[PDB]
Amino acid sequence: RLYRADSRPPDEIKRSGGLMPRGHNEYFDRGTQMNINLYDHARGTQTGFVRYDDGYVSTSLSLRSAHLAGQSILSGYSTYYIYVIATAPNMFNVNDVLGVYSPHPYEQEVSALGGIPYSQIYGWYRVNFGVIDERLHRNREYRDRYYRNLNIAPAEDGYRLAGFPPDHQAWREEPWIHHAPQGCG
Amino acid sequence: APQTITELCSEYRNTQIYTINDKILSYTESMAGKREMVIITFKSGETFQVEVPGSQHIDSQKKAIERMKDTLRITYLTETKIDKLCVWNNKTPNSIAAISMKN
Amino acid sequence: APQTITELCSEYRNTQIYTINDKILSYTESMAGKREMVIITFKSGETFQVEVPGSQHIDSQKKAIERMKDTLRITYLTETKIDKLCVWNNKTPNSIAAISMKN
Amino acid sequence: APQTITELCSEYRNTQIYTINDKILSYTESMAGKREMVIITFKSGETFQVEVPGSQHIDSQKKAIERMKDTLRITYLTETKIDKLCVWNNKTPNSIAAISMKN
Amino acid sequence: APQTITELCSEYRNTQIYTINDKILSYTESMAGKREMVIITFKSGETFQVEVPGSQHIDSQKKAIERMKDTLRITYLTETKIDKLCVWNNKTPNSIAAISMKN
Amino acid sequence: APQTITELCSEYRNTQIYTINDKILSYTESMAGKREMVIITFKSGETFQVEVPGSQHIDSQKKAIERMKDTLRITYLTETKIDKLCVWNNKTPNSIAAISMKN
Amino acid sequence: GDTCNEETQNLSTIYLREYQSKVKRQIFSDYQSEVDIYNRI
Numbered sequence A: 001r002l003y004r005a006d007s008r009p010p011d012e013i014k015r016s017g018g019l020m021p022r023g024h025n026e027y028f029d030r031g032t033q034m035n036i037n038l039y040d041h042a043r044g045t046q047t048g049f050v051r052y053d054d055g056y057v058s059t060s061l062s063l064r065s066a067h068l069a070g071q072s073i074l075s076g077y078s079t080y081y082i083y084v085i086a087t088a089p090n091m092f093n094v095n096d097v098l099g100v101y102s103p104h105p106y107e108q109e110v111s112a113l114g115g116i117p118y119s120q121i122y123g124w125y126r127v128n129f130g131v132i133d134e135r136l137h138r139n140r141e142y143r144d145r146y147y148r149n150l151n152i153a154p155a156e157d158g159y160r161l162a163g164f165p166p167d168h169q170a171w172r173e174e175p176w177i178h179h180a181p182q183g184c185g
Numbered sequence B, C, D, E, F: 001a002p003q004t005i006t007e008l009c010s011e012y013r014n015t016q017i018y019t020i021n022d023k024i025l026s027y028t029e030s031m032a033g034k035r036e037m038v039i040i041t042f043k044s045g046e047t048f049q050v051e052v053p054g055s056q057h058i059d060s061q062k063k064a065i066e067r068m069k070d071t072l073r074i075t076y077l078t079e080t081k082i083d084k085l086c087v088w089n090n091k092t093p094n095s096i097a098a099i100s101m102k103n
Numbered sequence G: 001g002d003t004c005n006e007e008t009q010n011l012s013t014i015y016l017r018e019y020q021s022k023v024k025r026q027i028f029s030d031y032q033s034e035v036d037i038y039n040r041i
């Protein structure tokens, strides 16, 4: 399971369709196409929100790490949440995919391409005056049978989705070269 | 007129109410001759069937048998907790008479 | 024709609107002889039923009764919010005539 | 045969096309005798109904009226955007003849 | 019996396989007299229909026509990819005879 | 009544249990005359069919056939794992007599 | 331009639309109600 610190409340997330990246209103909402790029999302530090720019929403591998981010990020807030997210193919390990050019390495992020649908969220914890309430609230709409056997997308699949700018050397080195989009390399 | 499942279950002979409170573990559906039925079981070890339409059923129950089998398939797929079951216990497995779901 | 549930409800004697604005708490379905019906309950304690088809119904209601039962099972399993109900208040539990959902 | 809803709508007298391009706001289903129907509305204020089966309907429309009520219910529940509606404007609310959805 | 849509498709005259490998772009449904039918299109510009039941249809096909429209409706909402279509090319739009989905 | 797909299957001649433990890979549906059917295949290579209602079918089996086809459509869409299948192996592809699923 | 990056953008959207369909197949299937064809016909 992965975790994300967020000021946005459960009922808001429910109306939105899940933890949405910056700018996207409804999860399925088409028409209003947004820029979806991994490398640009990974370098983008945002205040008021844990990295959720450029068609991706980032998460952390443990409650503690997610909690560390909320601390420095949602520092101002008197009450926020840490959502417990199930692993599925829409998520990519930013470190594994970006490699040497990993914007902020030692932070070990895993980003969900296009957001995190509500049915993929297991539950969440409330955090008051920066202290986690050890009572997880199960999301009644979490698809257990479905997400039970799912896991993160292997880095292989993220390579071409790497978003590196046209040149970036990676496009001319292992293993981004074996996967460079039509115009990269 | 009955307001709940236990009240409804009492209007009949040879019925028992079982508080299940759990989702169905397995669903089995058969179209084989004289065996057109649905069987479900639970983690508890309990097995229940929906009888093959037969001579012990009035014409009004015919459409009701189909609805019950439809309900068991969807409840299974959605992983919905069944609250209680009213069943005729003079059959093996015990025959379903009414279902109840809560929350 | 009526354009709203209230408008439609008022064309009948012995009816009234119940402003629900909530999802169904429990759903009970029965295939027991002469009592093939559905019963739903709300957090408020309000209990309504879909009637066993009898003489009181005209032939065109036959299909509408089955559909209403299909509608209530889906609403329940999906926790879809119900807006208002139009019920014939001359039955126990109050019998359902129309349902409306919103947003 | 028609290749589009506009082209199909044009073969009937008293019909008009409404470009909705929006999800349904509310849904109303009724099993009340003589008012076995469905009514839908949009945030724009539009209200349309699927008519109660009557002498104006040929036998082949009966199964289509039924399919249409099924379609509207699931379209509402899934919050799927409707594109256009072909409606007969000699009824109030306007009566649905055809529907189109685009992804 | 056949084991693939192509095998099945080749047992009839006036047919042909179209490999679509795409979701449906638009869905059209009609309950208009003599035009009770469904029409679908793809971003490839192809348009297909499920014909209105007629005398070119044998009785066993009647239940099948109905099922096909149910399938097309749910396939459309879920944005599920159609793999191939077997269609009679002697109709405009071409008439769907069978469908296949993969993954 | 049988309490298991295996037990039920063994009551028939020319049947055989296949342990699948996987989701359907592809779904084929046909409405072509004399070929109204569904054919499913798994990653493992097995291909199965729900056959055409012929003289080899009893009346109570016509409704059960439709139900099976409904089940196959929904399990394919939801990617639900089939556990076991009881098939009549005296046909090509083998015909489905019953299906089982668990989680 | 529509070289390296038009690709990444179009490729990412492709992966997403595929996933979104897997999701709809889950949550929208809960609304599917089966019909008695022999009663319809």
Ligand SMILES: CC(=O)N[C@@H]1[C@@H](O[C@@H]2O[C@H](CO)[C@H](O)[C@H](O)[C@H]2O)[C@@H](O)[C@@H](CO)O[C@@H]1O
Pocket: B013, B014, B051, B055, B056, B057, B058, B061, B088, B090, B091, B095, C032, C033
């Ligand atoms: C207890 C009993 O034998 N009752 C009779 C009915 O039997 C029950 O019927 C249900 C279906 O309605 C189910 O099969 C039960 O297991 C069965 O015992 C039935 O035969 C009806 C016929 O009018 O009345 C009996 O009294």
